[PDB]
Each structure stands twice: as structure tokens, then as C-alpha cells.
């Protein structure tokens, strides 16, 4: 699971070679930055249910056209599964900010994303539009410091960047 | 491979909920320092870690180095000294992630039916890890001893505290005898 | 040449990758480390030959029977290709403090050196017995901070277990 | 490949000498966290950069999607889209590391002869680097406009200072210049 | 195990032949050259003791300072240890002898040597100089044939290349 | 692998003594030319050893050629012919060594699970090895009858002696039995 | 081309190694029995037309049918190529007993053979009954020595092999 | 590869011809023993042949170990000692075989033109090329001087003729020659 210390022990492995260095400064750097990142990871947790659903509600205030009959967000099952995703992503975020890497997003929501929605005819526009309206909402200091607000605004443009 | 952090989020997906603990993710983070103290201190010193450990293995059983010895001849010492330098690695390796997943995936699965084939001892073998697990407790703490250190004694200068990272002296014992337990 | 970041940039180009979050928090690493090499690096830069001179007098102290006739330090000319030597290393180390990674030492120190010295019939004792000297030989805070010599330390029982 | 601090470090060993400037040095440490925004702007940005940019090489010429034309069919305009993103991608790793030596070595080596043995055209590929370089000035200086947005406009909310790191957009606007430099 | 037969039909296993006429007339080759390497065989069987016991005394004649304390001749251990590898190389030249051919020599002498006495912190200048003792010690027809000579320095020469 | 002389030296090494039996090694070097003419009679003779030896295998026991039979259909004929002459080819290694190592390790290692899992029937590959045994012995001696051979036949004119080398004869007619041996 | 030297030479070349006791021991190989079939080439080069053209009468002799309209030995030109190709096969028999191996043999005689014959469909038997003549025909001391014939012999059961 | 006898077949091939002149033939086998002799006195000191050779090649050409040189820094030493080893191994081979072919195809062609793109420096390369061809010269007659050899002086003890095998020597040189030809 790709995070700062997988990558350069992985790197080690390659060349035969004990941590060094470079090694040991690229973690320093993990100790400096989780004050931002695991600040952002603490308000989403206490959150994520509200933030889920307003980022659902604009995707649907977008595309009205879901809800006609035979389209996406049309019946009960559908509404609660389509909510169900956009939460799924902003745990997936959630995880990401703890790890410090893009791990948990790339092996459990991007990976055979394009293809389960290809094979059920979902539109890509929608979640795209939600993750789009959660990256232009937040605000510092209101929200949360300015470097943790970097932090999760990068992992939304990161899921927006897989989608499109 | 997984680390500390990677650890919790697997844990916390098989529930799909959270990571909800921010204090314990705050208190590693607040011991950082000293793990990376801890890593340096096994690096700094691994190849005299690494022969005095087979020396020492040899000393306490002089069958090694005879006719039919495992030991013996020369490309045998040399592929002995070889592994104990392997292990060592990856036990630095899972120190440096918090989590024994690269030590478990990369270096002890296999290891044990791959040393019946060869005929490799394994009492041997685990007593060769038990020296370098002592050793690695005394350079973490920066307490090794003149009588052991063979004229080549290193100090690392650390932050001294009471404790001397006790926390971390016991996880990397952990990982050595996760290596014991493989092999026996 | 290894440092933090070619090694971030390395993993990201085999996974055909843009840089992302774990990449800029190992750089912020970087950042937050230099102030400790750099002082090392600007102290060993204004006294190199000094620094050098004494190890390489440590390494004759040990070793008296160079000095004697066909032997490694008993003429003029390799006295002072011996103490070129413990200077070449020490500049090396001056170096990978600059990049931050082992790098320079790597590539234009160890690389080669046990089939150059196994060629010429130059012993390795007194070359670990230089750099021992030199591992030893530091305090803080008076020739440097703490976390400095820390860096230095690092650098020099790098290159010993390159020879041990 | 080189990074800004090597680079510095093999004009030294031209001389055999001890790396004794430090200026420049702690100067570019003082910018690292201005530099890290600027990669953070073009890589959290490049989907959009890539597809506008092509689409505005399209738009100035309308010969590249008909009949003989580069980006007919689907399988070339898709093989063109790849190719601004592997471009721009290298230039992202060239700022991140301040130094060009890995998208000359790993990019542009070859890149010109590649092209002309395809009948890729010269003129349009320029102008695509052109279009993305102007959208990287723009996305540093965190200063995109709305009517070049098309909907989709983005705001970083780095610390502004007067200039609006007019050294690092010389700098991005370089490295974008040797693409072009290949190609003619 | 390296012989003038193993490499002949080495070959032939490669491209799927028989034995052939170039095969049978390289082992024509080991009937003829086995008088004097067998001589030399029988004379080092009968004598290694003795043989060793002068090379090994030659070489801390050479390098007294290995008598100091903390170095590698300096106990009852070490200097047992010393001359017993003399006998090692003495044994495995032996054998050489007895094949036609230097397998038994590479195999168990010198694969692994290198990084053996690099671990140990073993100078390799005094295995060198307990050989070259050996290699300059012999005349014939005093201690055996001309030819015989010849056989028994040709591998004590291939020894001491191998440390040089 | 090893030979006559190699074989002797891992067997003083288990003890670390020297090889001190000259007499042993001066015997098979007086016998050396005789070996040489060994290996060229069977060499000389190959293919007319393996078509006669398979034909044979073939004549007493005709379901292998209906079928069902594992010398049908022409694909499994030709395979079988193939084998024989690796066979033969490997044996007539070991005895210009004077060592079974390299037929052991080379051919038939792996040869009985090999066989089992192809169905190649063990009963009818013992007859074909004991009539290339017999022909071997024949021609080392250099008495074979124009019974078996008609105008095939083949003298060799190596000098005769009184036992027609007869622990020659003895020691290919092991190897013979080592790779019957090796199918059990 | 193979020979005794040149398979020691690339046995050497492949593991990097100067040439070595087995290789000299090899080529010692090549002194002593370069007499028998040296004396064998000499006879070859004086009387090759006379040994060719008995063995080729021997196989049309045996196969009569080959006269007959349409068959491979029926015109003029045909009777003078099948001549003609003994004569290269005793010709490059003569090479191989120079060089000491099989070399001109499988490289200018037997490499290709086979596809040749049959897109010419050119009979297999006469070629094997032509070397069998030759096979059996010699005799010691009348032709050459024992040795020397012992030689000769095996070259011409090298080449009926490679056609059975 | 080619050998002495081969090459003399090839020439024979050339024009569909018998290989008529035995009598060059039967001189290279009765100096054959003296060939052994000069290729083990090359073989068995090549080590320190190739330490001194490159060591002149440095002290009368010291800007090779200063700034910019090409045996600076310590991996380029390695390789060129490395190289130094390559030639001297091919030229043995070459005089073994009694034929300049193995050097010609496994070691010279090309090498010119590879050691330009690399900038490694023609005079020096010739340079040690020399003086490993005058140490040659004196290990074949079995006079090398304690003025350039000191303690490591090596006699090793062939039997003397007034010649001190001049043709074998002049051959040797030869080979020598080539490679400079090659390279200059
Ligand atoms: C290794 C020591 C051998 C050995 C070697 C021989 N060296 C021979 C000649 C020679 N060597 C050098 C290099 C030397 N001269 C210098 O000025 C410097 C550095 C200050 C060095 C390292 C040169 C230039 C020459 C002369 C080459 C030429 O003529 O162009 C040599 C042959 C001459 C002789 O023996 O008198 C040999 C054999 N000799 C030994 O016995 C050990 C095994
Ligand atoms: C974990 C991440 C996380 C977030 C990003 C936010 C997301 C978020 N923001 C708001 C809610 C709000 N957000 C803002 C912010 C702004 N209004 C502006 O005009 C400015 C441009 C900007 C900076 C002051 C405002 C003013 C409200 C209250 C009014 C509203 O709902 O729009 C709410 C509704 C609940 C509330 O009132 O707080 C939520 C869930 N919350 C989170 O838990
Ligand atoms: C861990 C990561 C992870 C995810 C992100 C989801 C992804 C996902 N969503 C659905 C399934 C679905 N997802 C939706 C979603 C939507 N409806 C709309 O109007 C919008 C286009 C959109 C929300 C933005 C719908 C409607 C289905 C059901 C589709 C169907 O059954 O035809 C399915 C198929 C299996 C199922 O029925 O649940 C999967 C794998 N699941 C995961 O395991
Ligand atoms: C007769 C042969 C023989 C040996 C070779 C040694 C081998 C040896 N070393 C240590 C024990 C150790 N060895 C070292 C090693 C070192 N300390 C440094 O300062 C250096 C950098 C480094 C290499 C010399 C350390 C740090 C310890 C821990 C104990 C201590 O320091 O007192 C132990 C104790 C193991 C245990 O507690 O289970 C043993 C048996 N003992 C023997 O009886
Ligand atoms: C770039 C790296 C760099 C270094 C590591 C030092 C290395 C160094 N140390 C000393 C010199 C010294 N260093 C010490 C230090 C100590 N004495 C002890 O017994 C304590 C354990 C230890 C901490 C107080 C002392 C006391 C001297 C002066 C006396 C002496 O020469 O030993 C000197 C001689 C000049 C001087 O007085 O400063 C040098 C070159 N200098 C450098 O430029
Ligand atoms: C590491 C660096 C690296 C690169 C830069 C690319 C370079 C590259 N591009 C293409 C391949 C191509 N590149 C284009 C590009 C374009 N067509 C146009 O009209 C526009 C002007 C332009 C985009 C701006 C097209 C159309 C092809 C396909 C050409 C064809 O098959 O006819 C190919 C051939 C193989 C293939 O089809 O993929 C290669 C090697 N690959 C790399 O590995
Ligand atoms: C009719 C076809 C046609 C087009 C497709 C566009 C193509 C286009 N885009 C831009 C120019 C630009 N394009 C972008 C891109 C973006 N800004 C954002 O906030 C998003 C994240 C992202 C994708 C939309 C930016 C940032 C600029 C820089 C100039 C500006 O922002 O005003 C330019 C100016 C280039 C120059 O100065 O040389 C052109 C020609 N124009 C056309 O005539
Ligand atoms: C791991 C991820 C990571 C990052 C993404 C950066 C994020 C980052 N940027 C700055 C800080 C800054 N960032 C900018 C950047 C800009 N100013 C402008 O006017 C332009 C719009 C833009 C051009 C690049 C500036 C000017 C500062 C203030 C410090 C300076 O002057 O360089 C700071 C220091 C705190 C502060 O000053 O508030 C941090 C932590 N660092 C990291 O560790
Ligand atoms: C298996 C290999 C094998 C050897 C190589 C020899 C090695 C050897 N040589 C000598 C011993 C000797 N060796 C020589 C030889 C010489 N003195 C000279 O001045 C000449 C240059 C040279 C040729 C005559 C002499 C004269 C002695 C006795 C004096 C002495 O010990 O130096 C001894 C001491 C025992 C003895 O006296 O024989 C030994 C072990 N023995 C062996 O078993
Ligand atoms: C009806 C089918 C049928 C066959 C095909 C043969 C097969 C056959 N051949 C031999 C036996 C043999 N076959 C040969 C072969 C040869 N001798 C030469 O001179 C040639 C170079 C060469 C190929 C012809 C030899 C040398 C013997 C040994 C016995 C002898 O020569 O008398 C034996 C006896 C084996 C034994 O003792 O167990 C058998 C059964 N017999 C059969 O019943
Ligand atoms: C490179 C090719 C090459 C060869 C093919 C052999 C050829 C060869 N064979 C013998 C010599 C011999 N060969 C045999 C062989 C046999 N006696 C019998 O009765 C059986 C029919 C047969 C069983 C194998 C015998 C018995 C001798 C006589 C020497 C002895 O008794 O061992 C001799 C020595 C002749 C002499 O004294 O001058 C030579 C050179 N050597 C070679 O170098
Ligand atoms: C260097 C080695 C070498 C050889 C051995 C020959 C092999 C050879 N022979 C022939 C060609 C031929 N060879 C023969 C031979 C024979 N007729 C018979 O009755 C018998 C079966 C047989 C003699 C024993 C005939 C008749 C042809 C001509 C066939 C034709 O043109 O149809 C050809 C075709 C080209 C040509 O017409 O010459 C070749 C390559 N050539 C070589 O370069
Ligand atoms: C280069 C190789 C080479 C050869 C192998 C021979 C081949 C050869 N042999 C004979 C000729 C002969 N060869 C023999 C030999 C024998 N008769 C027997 O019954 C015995 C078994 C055998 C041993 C005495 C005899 C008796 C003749 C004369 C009668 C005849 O032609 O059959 C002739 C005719 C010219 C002559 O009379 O010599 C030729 C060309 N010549 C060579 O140049
Ligand atoms: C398997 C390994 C093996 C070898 C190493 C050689 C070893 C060897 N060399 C010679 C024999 C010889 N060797 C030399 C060599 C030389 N004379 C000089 O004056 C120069 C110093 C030197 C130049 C090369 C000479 C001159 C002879 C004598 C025979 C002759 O004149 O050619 C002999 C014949 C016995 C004798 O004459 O004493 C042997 C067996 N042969 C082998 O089988
Ligand atoms: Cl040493
Ligand atoms: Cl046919
Ligand atoms: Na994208
Ligand atoms: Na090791
Ligand atoms: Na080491
Ligand atoms: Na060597
Ligand atoms: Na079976
Ligand atoms: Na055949
Ligand atoms: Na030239």
C-alpha cells in the first residue's frame, strides 16, 4: 500500500540496501506533515455523513435527469446506492490522509472502477460533479487549517484527475 | 507491504467504518523521532553486528568449521554471513514501517522448508539471530559494552531519557522472535 | 544519483505516475533535514584539511609498519597519495550532506574500490581505521549541533561498513 | 537523473573541490514550499490542462480532425492526448526536482526522430506545448481566468506575495521552451 | 568440478554430441601429463606439514605486527587458525594436482574468500606472502622433476592471482 | 559433475586429509588408452545400437505398434528412438569419466516421474536399455556376430588381449543398470 | 571451428578465466596424437581420387537401379556430381583429421544435408554405402599405421552416423 | 574461432583443395611444448603484469588521476585495470591457439569505436598495451630484471635454449601489435 515509507523500503529491497540517509529524511517528512493531514482526517471522521450528503445532493442538483424512469438515481435502491458511493469515496479519502500516500484510494475505489460502471451503464459525470462540488466547498480557518484543507483538496482533485 | 497506519486502515475497512482513534495515530507520530534514532542505530552498526554474531555462533559450536560442518569450506561461511546480513535488513526494514509484513512476505515465508532442503541447522541458525537480537537491544538503548565491542565500541549520542525507548527495544525484539519462531 | 527526491521521481516514472501526496511530504523532509547537513557540510567544507590530516595520522598510529621499506605509506610520493585518499573520502562525505542521500559516495567512492586496492596490494585496515577515527572524534555542541553530527556520524559509518 | 542540489555537486568535482557556496543552496530551500505548491498546481490540474490544450490545437486547425489529418481517427487522438500528458508529466518531475536532466534523458532523447518516422506534424505539437505552458504560468500564479475555465474553474489558496512566484513560472515556461527546442 | 574430462563433456552436453575425436584426444592429453603432476601430488601428500609450517613461518617473519595485541596472529586461537588455512590452500593444491584441472581449488579455496576475510577484518597480504614463500621455495631436481615443479608452482601462482 | 579422480577428492575431503592411495590412480591411468577405445566402439556405433535396440523392444512385444500402444502413431515412434540415444549418449559419458555423476544428475534425475506422467511403460523401456547393454559389451570386446548385425557388421582393430577388457565391460554394463535402476 | 583448443578456448572465455592447467593439459592431448592422424591426412592427400572413386563404384555397383531413366545416377552429369560429393566428403574428412575435431565436417559437410537430399530426392543408402566401403576397406600395416587408421575410421562412422 | 590448423583448412577450402604441406604443420606440434611454456609464464603473472602496466601508464601520465582524468574517480580506475586484464586474456588465447581470429571477433572489432563514444584516451590505452608486450617478451625467455619487479620477481624454470624461443616471442609481439594497430 503505497504511502512514504513503503515507497523508499521498496526502493531499498530493489538495490539490496539498509534504510540510509535519504531513507530516514523522506519519513521526517511524514512526522512534519501529519499535523495537516491528520487534522483534516480527524474532521472528516467526525463528519463524513453530512459532507457525504450534501456532495450526493449537488451531483442530483445537477443532473435532475437521474431521476426519471429507467435512469440512475430513479428508484429507492438506486438513491441509497449512489449515496452509498459518494460515501464510499470520502472514507476512501478519510484513510488516505491517515496513511499519508494514495494507497487506499488507488487498490479500493479506482482500481476496476471504470469498468463496474461501464458494465451497469452509471454516468462517470455525477460522481465527478460531487467530488468537484466537495473541493470547492471548503473554506480555512472556518473548516480547518489552511495546509489541512491543502491536504484534502488534493486527494479530491486526485479521485476528480481518475475519473476524467 | 503494509505500515503502522496502513495496519489500522485495513482493520478499520473490515467494519467499512472510519479511522476514528486520532490519539494513538498522534502518540506514534510523537515517537517518530526515536524510531528513526532506533533504525539508524541497527545501520550504523550492521556489519560488525553481523560478524560478531557468526563468530559467536561459531565459537559456541566449533562442528561448524570441520569436515562436514556447515560452515565449511569457504563458500559456506560466506553464503552463512550472507543471510545473517539478509535477516538483519529486513528486520531493520520492519522497524522502519512499524508493521512486520515486509519481514513476514519477503524474507520468512519459505524460509524454513528452503533450509531443510539444504540441510542448513537450525539450531544454529536461531542462535546466530538471538546474538543480534541482544545486540540490537544494547545499540537502540546506546548502552553497549567495552567487554563485547572488540576494540570497535560505537556511541550514537542520542536524547537520553529514563527509559531508555524501552516501547521500542520491545518491538524490535518482536520481529527476532518472529524470525525464531519461523525457523524453529 | 540517489537523494530523496530522484528516488520519489524514479518510483513515480516506473508507475507512470504525477507526483502526489506521499512524493511533496519525502521533499518536505528534505526541507525540514537541511538545516543539520548543511551546518555539517559548511563546517567540513572550512576545515577538510584538517579533519582529514588527523585521521590520516590515526591510520599511521595504528598501522607503524607501513612505514617500513616496500610497504604502503614508505616513500614521499605515497605518503601523500595516502592522505589524498582520506581527503577523496571526506569530500565525498561533503558532498552527500549537500544532496542528502549517499549518492556521491555510491558512485564515485565505493564503486570500484576493493578491485582497485586488492590490484595495488593496499591494505583496508587503515582506511577503516581513518574514518573510525574520524566517527569517534566529534562533540556537541562544540564543533557542531547535535543533530549535525548525527548527519556526519551517519556518513562515516556508511562508508566503514562499505569496507567491512 | 540530476536534482538541483547534484547538479551543484558535479560543477564541484570538476575541480576536485569542496562545495563552498551555500547561498544558492539555503536560497532554494527557502522556496521549497512555494515549489511544492507549484507541482501541486499542475499535477492536481492536468486532466484539464491536457484536454483543453489539445482541443485548442484542434480548434486553430481543423485539417488535423479530417480526412489524412493526425487525430483521425479515434485511435490517434487518443495516442495524441497520451502524448501531451507523458509531456507535461516530465516537465512536472524537471520543476519538482529543479533540474531538466530527467525529461531530457527519459522524454526528449529520440523524440523528434520518433515523430518524423510517424509523420507526426511539428507545427500543431508545438503549439499544444505552447497552449500548456500558458496554463501552468496561469495555475502557479494561482490566477486562471473563468473564460478560459469552461466551467471547470480551480483556485489553490496558497499564501500570495507580490510577485506570484515569478521565479518558478520563468523557470516552468523553460523547461516547456526545451520540449519545443526538440521538436524544431 | 573443473577438469580436463568435465569441461570436454560439458561441451559435448551443450550441442547434444557424443564423444568425438577432439573429446578422446584432450584425455589422451591427461594420460600423458599425469606422471609429473601425480609426482608432485605424492611428494605434497607425504610432506604438508612441513610445507605449511614454513610458508606460515614466512609470512609472520614478513608481518611481525600481527603478533601485537588485538591483531590476527596475536593469540593461541588465532595463530592455530592461521596456520591451519596455510594447510586449507596446501590440501586444495594437493588435490588440484590429483584432477588435472583447478576444481577443487575454486569450489572450496577461493569462491567466498574475498568476502570471508572482509567480514573477519583478515589482511589478505599475508596469505599472499605464505604462498609466494611456497611458490619461490622449490628446485629440481632436489625436491622433485623439473616438470613436476612446474605442475606444483603453475597452481600456487593461480592461488596467489586469485588474492591479487 | 564429477570424475574417477574428483570422486576420490570428495571422499578424502570428508575427512580433510590428503588423497594418499597413488597406486589406485596410476591403475586407472595404465588403463586409459583401453577406455578411449571403449567409448569410440560405442560412440562408432550409435545409431545402428539404438534402431536395433528399439526394434527389438518392438519385436517381442508387438502392442506397442496397434493402437493404444506408446509407439504409436509415427510421433511416439520418433520420441522413442530419441530417448535411447540420450540415453546411450549419457552413458557413454560416464564412462570416459569413469564416474556415474553426470548420468545421474543430467538424465535421470526426474526420469521415473517423468516417464509416470507421460505413461511411457517401464516394462518395454527395461528391454530396450538391456539390449543396448549387450551390444555395448559386444563391441568393447570387439566380438560382434554377424547373426545380429548381417552387413552392418563392424571390426573395430583395437589390440587384443586374453580378458577383452573385462572390468571395462563390467563397469559400462553398471552404468546400464544404474539407469534400469533409476526407473524403480 | 571445433577443435581441442578452440573448446577449451570458449570454455574459458565463458567463465572469463586465462588458460589453466586442465586447457594446457588438453592441448598436450593434440602433441601425441597429432602423428596417427597427420599420417592419415598425408595418405588422404596423395591418393584421395583413387579412395573416392572405388567407393563410389562400390555404391552403384550395389544399386544398379540408379542407371535407369529418371534415377539419380542416370546422365553424365549426375555420375559426375555423385563422384564429385564423395570426393567432399573425403576431402573434408581429410580437414577434420589437420584440425584434430569434427569442425569442417559438421560445419561444410553434414550442417544442411539432410534438406538438401531430399528437395533434390537424392537417396540417403548410396551415400552410406559409398563411407561404408571406405569403412571397411582399410587395413594395418599395408595403408597406414594402426593408429592412423584407427583415426580415419572413426571420421568415416562420424559422417554414416549423421545420416542414419 | 580459428586455431593454426584451422586456418590452414580454410585457406585449403578457398579453392576446393587438399591440405598438401604437412611439413609447417609438424613444426608448430614439435615446438608445441615450449607454446605451453610461454602461455604459462604470461598466464601465471598476469596479475602483476597488469598492476605495473597500468601503475607506468599513470606515472607518466598523471593528469589521468588528477581532475577530469580518465582513471578518476575510483570506478573508473576499476575499469580500466578490468580492461587492461580483458586485452592480456584475449592475446592468450591468441597465442594458445597459435591464431590472432578469437582476438580479432571477441575483443578488437568494434572496440575502437567504443572506447570513442566513452572518451577514453587512445595514447594512454597504447601505452599500457606497450608495456604489457615488453613484460611478455621477458616472462617467455625467463629473464624479467629485479630493477622492475623487486620482491615479486617470478623464474619460472623452463629448460634453456641459446634462442630463448625468439619465434614464440615474435609472435607473441605480434599479437601485441595488432591490438595497438586496432586501437591507434
Ligand atoms: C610484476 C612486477 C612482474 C614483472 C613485471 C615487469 N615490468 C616490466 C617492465 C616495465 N614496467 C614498467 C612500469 C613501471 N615503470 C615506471 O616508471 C613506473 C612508475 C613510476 C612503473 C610502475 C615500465 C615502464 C616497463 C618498461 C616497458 C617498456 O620497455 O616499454 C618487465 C619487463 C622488463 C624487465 O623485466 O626488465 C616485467 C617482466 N616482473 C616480475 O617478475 C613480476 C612477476
Ligand atoms: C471534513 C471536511 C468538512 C468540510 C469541507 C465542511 C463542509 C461543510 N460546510 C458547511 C457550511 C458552510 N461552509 C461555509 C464556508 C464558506 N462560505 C463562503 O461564502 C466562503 C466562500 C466559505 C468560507 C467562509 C459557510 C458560510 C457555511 C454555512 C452556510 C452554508 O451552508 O453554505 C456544512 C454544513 C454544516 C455547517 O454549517 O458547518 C458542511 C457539511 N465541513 C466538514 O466537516
Ligand atoms: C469501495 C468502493 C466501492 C464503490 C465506490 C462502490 C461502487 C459500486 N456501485 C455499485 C452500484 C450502483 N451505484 C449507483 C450509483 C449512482 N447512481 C446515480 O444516479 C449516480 C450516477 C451514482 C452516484 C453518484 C447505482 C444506481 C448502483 C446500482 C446499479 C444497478 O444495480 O443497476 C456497484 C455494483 C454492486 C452493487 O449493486 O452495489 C459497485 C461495485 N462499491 C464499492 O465497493
Ligand atoms: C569466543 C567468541 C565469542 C564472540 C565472537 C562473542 C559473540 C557475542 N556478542 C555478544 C553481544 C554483543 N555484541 C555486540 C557488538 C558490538 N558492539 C559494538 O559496540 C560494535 C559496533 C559491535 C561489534 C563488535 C553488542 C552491542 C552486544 C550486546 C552486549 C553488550 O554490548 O554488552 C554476545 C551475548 C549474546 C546474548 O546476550 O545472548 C555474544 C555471545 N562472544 C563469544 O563468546
Ligand atoms: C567537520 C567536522 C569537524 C570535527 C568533528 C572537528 C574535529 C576536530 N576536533 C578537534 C579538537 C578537539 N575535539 C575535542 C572533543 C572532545 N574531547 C573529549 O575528550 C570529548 C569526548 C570530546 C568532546 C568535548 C577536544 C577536547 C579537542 C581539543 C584537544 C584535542 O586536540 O584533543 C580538532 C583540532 C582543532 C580544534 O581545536 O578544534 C579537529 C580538527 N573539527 C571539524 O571541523
Ligand atoms: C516517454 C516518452 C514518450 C512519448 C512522448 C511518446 C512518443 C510516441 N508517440 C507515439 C504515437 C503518436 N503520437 C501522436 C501525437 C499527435 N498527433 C497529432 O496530430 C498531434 C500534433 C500530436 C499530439 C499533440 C499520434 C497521432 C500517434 C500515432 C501515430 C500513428 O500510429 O499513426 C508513438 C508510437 C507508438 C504508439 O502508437 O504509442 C511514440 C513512441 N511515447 C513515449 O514513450
Ligand atoms: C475553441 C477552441 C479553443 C480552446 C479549447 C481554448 C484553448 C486555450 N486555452 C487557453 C488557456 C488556459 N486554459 C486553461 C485551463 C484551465 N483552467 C482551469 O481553471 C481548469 C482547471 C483548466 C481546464 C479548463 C488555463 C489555466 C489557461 C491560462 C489562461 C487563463 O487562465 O486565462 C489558451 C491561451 C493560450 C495562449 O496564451 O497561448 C487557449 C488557446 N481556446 C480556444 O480557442
Ligand atoms: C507536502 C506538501 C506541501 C505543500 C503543497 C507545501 C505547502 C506550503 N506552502 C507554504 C508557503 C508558500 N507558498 C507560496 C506559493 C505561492 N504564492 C503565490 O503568490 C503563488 C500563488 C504561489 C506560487 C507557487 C508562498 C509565497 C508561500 C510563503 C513562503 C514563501 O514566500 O516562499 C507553506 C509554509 C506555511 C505558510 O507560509 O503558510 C506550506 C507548508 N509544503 C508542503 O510540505
Ligand atoms: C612438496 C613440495 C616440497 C618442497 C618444494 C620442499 C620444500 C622444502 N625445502 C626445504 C629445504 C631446502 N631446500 C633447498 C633448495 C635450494 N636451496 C638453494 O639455495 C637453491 C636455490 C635451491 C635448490 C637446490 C635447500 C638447500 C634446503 C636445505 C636448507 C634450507 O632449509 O634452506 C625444506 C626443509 C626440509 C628439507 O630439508 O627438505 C622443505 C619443507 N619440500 C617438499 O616436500
Ligand atoms: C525380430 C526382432 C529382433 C531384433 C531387432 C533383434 C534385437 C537384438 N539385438 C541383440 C544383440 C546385438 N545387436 C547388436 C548390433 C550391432 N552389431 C553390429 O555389428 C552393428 C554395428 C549393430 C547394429 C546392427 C550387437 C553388437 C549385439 C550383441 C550380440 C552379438 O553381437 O552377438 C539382441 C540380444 C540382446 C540380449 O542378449 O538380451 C536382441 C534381442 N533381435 C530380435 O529378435
Ligand atoms: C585419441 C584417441 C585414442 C584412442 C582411441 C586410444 C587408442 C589406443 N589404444 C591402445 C591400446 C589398447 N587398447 C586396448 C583395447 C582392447 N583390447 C581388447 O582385447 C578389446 C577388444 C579392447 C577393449 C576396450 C588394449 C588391450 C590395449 C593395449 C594396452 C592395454 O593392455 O591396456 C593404444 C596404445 C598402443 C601402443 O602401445 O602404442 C592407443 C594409442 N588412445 C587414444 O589416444
Ligand atoms: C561441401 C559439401 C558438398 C557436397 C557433399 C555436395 C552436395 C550436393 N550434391 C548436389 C547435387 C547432386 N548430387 C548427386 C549425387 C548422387 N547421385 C546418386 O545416384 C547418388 C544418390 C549420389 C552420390 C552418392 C546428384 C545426381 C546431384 C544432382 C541432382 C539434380 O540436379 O537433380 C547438390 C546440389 C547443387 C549441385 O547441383 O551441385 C549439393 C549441394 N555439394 C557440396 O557443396
Ligand atoms: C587414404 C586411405 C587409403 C586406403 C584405405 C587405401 C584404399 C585402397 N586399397 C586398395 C587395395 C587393396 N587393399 C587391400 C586390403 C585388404 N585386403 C584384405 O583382404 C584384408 C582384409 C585387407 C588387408 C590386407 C588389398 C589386398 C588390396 C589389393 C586388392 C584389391 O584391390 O582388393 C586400393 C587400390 C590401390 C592399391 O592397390 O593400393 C585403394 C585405393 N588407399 C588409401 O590411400
Ligand atoms: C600441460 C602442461 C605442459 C607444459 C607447461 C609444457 C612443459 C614442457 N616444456 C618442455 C620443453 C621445453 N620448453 C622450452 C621453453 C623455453 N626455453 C627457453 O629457452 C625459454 C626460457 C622458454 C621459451 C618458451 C624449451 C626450449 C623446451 C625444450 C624443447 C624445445 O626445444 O622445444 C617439455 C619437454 C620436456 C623437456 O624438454 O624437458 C615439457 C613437458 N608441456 C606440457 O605438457
Ligand atoms: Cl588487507
Ligand atoms: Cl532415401
Ligand atoms: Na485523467
Ligand atoms: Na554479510
Ligand atoms: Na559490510
Ligand atoms: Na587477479
Ligand atoms: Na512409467
Ligand atoms: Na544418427
Ligand atoms: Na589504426
Known amino acids: ?164 | 507491504m503494509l505500515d503502522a497506519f496502513s495496519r489500522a486502515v485495513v482493520q478499520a475497512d473490515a467494519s467499512t467504518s472510519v479511522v476514528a482513534d486520532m490519539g494513538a495515530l498522534k502518540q506514534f507520530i510523537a515517537e517518530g523521532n526515536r524510531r528513526l534514532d532506533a533504525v539508524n542505530a541497527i545501520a550504523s552498526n550492521a556489519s560488525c553486528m553481523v560478524s560478531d554474531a557468526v563468530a559467536g555462533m561459531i565459537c559456541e559450536n566449533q562442528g561448524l568449521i570441520q569436515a562436514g560442518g556447515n560452515c565449511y569450506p569457504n563458500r559456506r561461511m560466506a553464503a552463512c554471513l550472507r543471510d545473517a546480513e539478509i535477516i538483519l535488513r529486513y528486520v531493520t526494514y520492519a522497524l522502519l514501517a512499524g508493521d512486520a509484513s515486509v519481514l513476514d512476505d519477503r524474507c520468512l515465508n519459505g524460509l524454513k522448508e528452503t533450509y531443510a532442503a539444504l540441510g542448513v541447522p537450525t539450531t544454529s541458525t536461531v542462535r546466530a539471530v538471538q546474538i543480534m537480537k541482544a545486540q540490537a537491544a544494547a545499540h537502540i538503548k546506546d548502552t553497549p559494552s567495552e567487554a563485547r565491542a572488540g576494540g570497535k565500541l560505537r556511541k550514537m549520542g542520542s536524547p537520553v531519557v529514563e527509559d531508555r525507548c524501552a516501547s521500542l527495544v520491545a518491538e524490535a525484539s518482536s520481529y527476532f522472535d518472529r524470525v525464531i519462531s519461523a525457523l524453529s
Not at chain 1, 463528519?47 to 442538483?61: F, G, L, P, R, S
Not at chain 1, 484543507?149 to 481518475?162: G, Q, V, W
Open chain 1, 1 to 164: 500500500m503505497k504511502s512514504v515509507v513503503t515507497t523508499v523500503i521498496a526502493a531499498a529491497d530493489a538495490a539490496g540496501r539498509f534504510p540510509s540517509s535519504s531513507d530516514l529524511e523522506s519519513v521526517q517528512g511524514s512526522i512534519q506533515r501529519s499535523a495537516a493531514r491528520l487534522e483534516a482526517a480527524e474532521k472528516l471522521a467526525g463528519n463524513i455523513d453530512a459532507v457525504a450528503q450534501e456532495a450526493y445532493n449537488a451531483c442530483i442538483q445537477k443532473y435532475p435527469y437521474l431521476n426519471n424512469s429507467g435512469e440512475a438515481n430513479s428508484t429507492d435502491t438506486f438513491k441509497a446506492k449512489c449515496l452509498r458511493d459518494v460515501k464510499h469515496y470520502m472514507r476512501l479519502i478519510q484513510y488516505s490522509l491517515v496513511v499519508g500516500g494514495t494507497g487506499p484510494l488507488d487498490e479500493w475505489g479506482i482500481a476496476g472502477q471504470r469498468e463496474v460502471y461501464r458494465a451497469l451503464g452509471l454516468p462517470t459525470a455525477p460522481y465527478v460533479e460531487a467530488l468537484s462540488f466537495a473541493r470547492n466547498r471548503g473554506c480555512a480557518p472556518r473548516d480547518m487549517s489552511a495546509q489541512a484543507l491543502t491536504e484534502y483538496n488534493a486527494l479530491l482533485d486526485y479521485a476528480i484527475n481518475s475519473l476524467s
